[PDB]
Design a protein around this ligand. Structure first.
Ligand SMILES: Nc1ncnc2c1ncn2[C@@H]1O[C@H](COP(=O)(O)O)[C@@H](O)[C@H]1O
Ligand SMILES: Nc1ncnc2c1ncn2[C@@H]1O[C@H](COP(=O)(O)O)[C@@H](O)[C@H]1O
Ligand SMILES: Nc1ncnc2c1ncn2[C@@H]1O[C@H](COP(=O)(O)O)[C@@H](O)[C@H]1O
Ligand SMILES: Nc1ncnc2c1ncn2[C@@H]1O[C@H](COP(=O)(O)O)[C@@H](O)[C@H]1O
Ligand SMILES: [Mg+2]
Ligand SMILES: [Mg+2]
Ligand SMILES: [Mg+2]
Ligand SMILES: [Mg+2]
Ligand SMILES: [Mg+2]
Lengths: 153, 153, 149, 157
C-alpha cells in the first residue's frame, strides 16, 4: 500500500484545478519564500507563490529529502505537482505538525535538537541574521540583506 | 569620535525628519522597510515598506551586532532612534558601501567569503536547506522554515 | 580530534631512521634547506642546503599557524637523517597557484583576511637598526618595516 | 657646496668603470638582494649583483630611489642616502649609496629597545613594524594559504 502522504497526493482533492482564493482559508503561513496551506487534516502544502513566482529552500525534491532524513521518516514529505490557477507547479507536501516552536536558543534545548539531528546525519546551525555580500576594490563587506545566513560560530 | 556616532549625533539626523524630503535618497525598499542614503557615508534603513505600512515575528536593528561581527568592525552599524513626522522610530544605520554584488553561486567565491567570516568567528551558509523545529506533545519535529540550517556537512 | 599532522609525525614513516639517498625522489624545493613531499598531504623543510629572517622551525611554525588560523597547519619536529637528529618544519601540502599581491585588489583582500587573524601583512619593500655610540641609525636591511602610513 | 655623499658620487673613484674583482676587498655583506661594499671611509654602495654574482617585485628594497627617500626620512637626514648610476663592466647600473654606520645591531626583541626605536621613528613620520617571518601566498579553489617563503612579511598584531 502507498504511504499516507502518497494517498493524499493521489486523492482527487489534491489533483483538482486549484484557485488560490479558494484555499485562502487554509493558509497558515506565507512570505517571500511562498505560502503554506493545510489542505488535509494531516498534511500541508507549500506553494511557490510570492504574495508570485535565489530563494530559500529552492527545490522541493532536495528539501523533501532533507526533511525525510532530519525526521528519520521516509514518509514525511514529497515533492509533487499541483495545478494552481491553470498552471502545473512543483510543490512540497509534508505531514502537518500541530505544535509550538522549539526555543533552540536556550542552550540545553540547543544540545537536545543538535544531538538528535546528528544521530540522523544532519548538522544543525542556528541562524542569527541574513545578509548580502558586497565587494569593493577586492574587499568584502556584509550588509543587511537576504542571500546568505550569518550566525555566530 | 566614531564617524557613525558623529552622524547619528549630527543635527541633520536628529531633527524632526519628514518622509517627503528624503524620497530622492531612496536606494532600496521591500516588505522589511526602506533604505535611504542620508549621508555620503551612511545609509539608514527605516521600517516602512514599498506601500508605507509599518517588533515581533530576526530583523530587529539591535543586526547591528551581527553586522559588526561579520565585518569585524565596532563602528559598522548602530541601532538608533530617529523621529519621522513627529514619531520616534528605531532605525538601523550602516556605513554606505559602494560596490558590486559578490556572487557566491561561484564555488571559489563562496569558499573565499566563508574563509574570511570564519576568521571573524562567523559561520556562513547558503539559504538552502533551512528549517524550523516544532514540538508536538514533547516530541521534536523538523519542518520547512527559516530558524536553522540543515546541512549534511 | 586527532590532528592529521600529529598522526603523520608520530608515525613510524616519519620516525624511521632516514637516508638522504632514500628521499631524493620526493624533492620539490631547494635553496640556502630543501622541501620534500613525504606524504600525500604534508611537506617537510629539512635544513640541508643546495649542507646546513629568524628562520627556526619552532618559530616559523608558530607564525604559519597564526597566519593560517589553523593550529594544525604546521609543526616543528625531530627527524633522523643519516643518524643525525635534525629539527624540521612540517606543514600541510597546498596544491595551488601563486596569488599575486602586486595586483592591488588581491593585496587588499589578503590583507583584510590576515587582519581578521591578528596578522599584519606588508610588501618586502624594509630596514635594519644599528646603534653607533648610543645613537640609533636606520639602514637598508630586513629587520623591520619602514612605512609612511 | 654639495653634500658629502654627493661629493663622493662625483668623485673619480665612484665614476670609474668598476670591476667587481677590484672591490672584493671592500665587501661587507651580500645576499639575495645584492652586495654591500665600503668604497669610501664614510660611504657604502649596495650593488644589485647577488651573492652568486648573477643578478623586481621578487626582491626586497627593489627601487633604490624610493629606499633612499625612506632612509633619509627615517634618519631625519636629507643627506643620508642617494640612488645613483654606476658603470660596472661597461654597463650602467642603479645603486644605493648610504652613509657608513659603524655600529652594532640594535636588539629590538627587548621591549624598551623596541619602544625607543618606535618612538624615534614616529617623531620622524615613519611607522615601524617588526617582522616575525616572511611567507608566500598560495590560492587553492578561491582560498588563500600562507606557506614558508620570502614574498611578504607576516607579523603578529
Ligand atoms: N509540516 C508543517 N507542519 C506544521 N507547520 C508547518 C509545516 N511546515 C511549515 N509549517 C509552518 O508554516 C509557517 C510558515 O509561515 P511563516 O511564519 O510566514 O514562515 C511556520 O509557522 C512553519 O513552522
Ligand atoms: N550599508 C549598505 N551600503 C550600501 N548598499 C546597501 C547597504 N545596505 C543595503 N544596501 C543596498 O540597499 C538595497 C536594498 O534594496 P533591496 O534589493 O530591495 O534589498 C540593496 O541594493 C542593498 O545592497
Ligand atoms: N606547505 C606547502 N604546500 C605547498 N607548497 C609549499 C609548501 N611550503 C612550501 N611550498 C613550496 O615549496 C617550494 C620551495 O621553494 P624553493 O626553496 O624556492 O624551492 C615553493 O614553490 C613553495 O611555494
Ligand atoms: N649604510 C650602512 N652602514 C653600515 N652598515 C650597513 C649599511 N647598509 C647596510 N649595512 C649592513 O651591511 C650588511 C650587508 O648585508 P647582509 O650582510 O647580507 O645583511 C648588513 O648587515 C647591513 O646591516
Ligand atoms: Mg535586493
Ligand atoms: Mg518560517
Ligand atoms: Mg640585511
Ligand atoms: Mg646579515
Ligand atoms: Mg619559492
Amino acid at each position: 500500500q502507498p504511504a499516507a502522504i502518497e494517498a493524499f497526493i493521489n486523492s482527487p482533492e489534491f489533483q483538482k484545478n486549484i484557485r488560490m482564493r479558494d484555499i485562502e482559508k487554509n493558509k497558515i503561513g506565507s512570505g517571500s519564500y511562498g505560502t503554506v496551506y493545510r489542505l488535509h487534516d494531516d498534511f500541508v502544502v507549500k506553494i511557490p507563490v510570492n504574495e508570485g513566482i535565489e530563494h530559500r529552500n529552492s527545490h522541493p525534491d532536495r528539501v523533501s529529502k532533507y526533511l525525510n532524513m532530519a525526521n528519520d521518516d521516509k514518509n514525511f514529505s514529497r515533492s509533487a505537482i499541483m495545478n494552481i490557477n491553470g498552471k502545473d507547479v512543483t510543490v512540497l507536501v509534508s505531514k502537518y505538525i500541530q505544535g509550538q516552536e522549539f526555543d533552540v536558543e536556550d542552550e540545553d534545548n540547543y544540545r537536545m535538537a543538535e544531538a538528535l539531528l546528528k544521530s540522523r546525519g544532519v548538522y544543525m546551525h542556528d541562524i542569527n541574521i541574513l545578509g548580502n555580500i558586497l565587494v569593493k576594490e577586492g574587499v568584502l563587506f556584509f550588509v543587511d540583506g537576504d542571500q546568505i545566513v550569518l550566525s555566530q560560530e
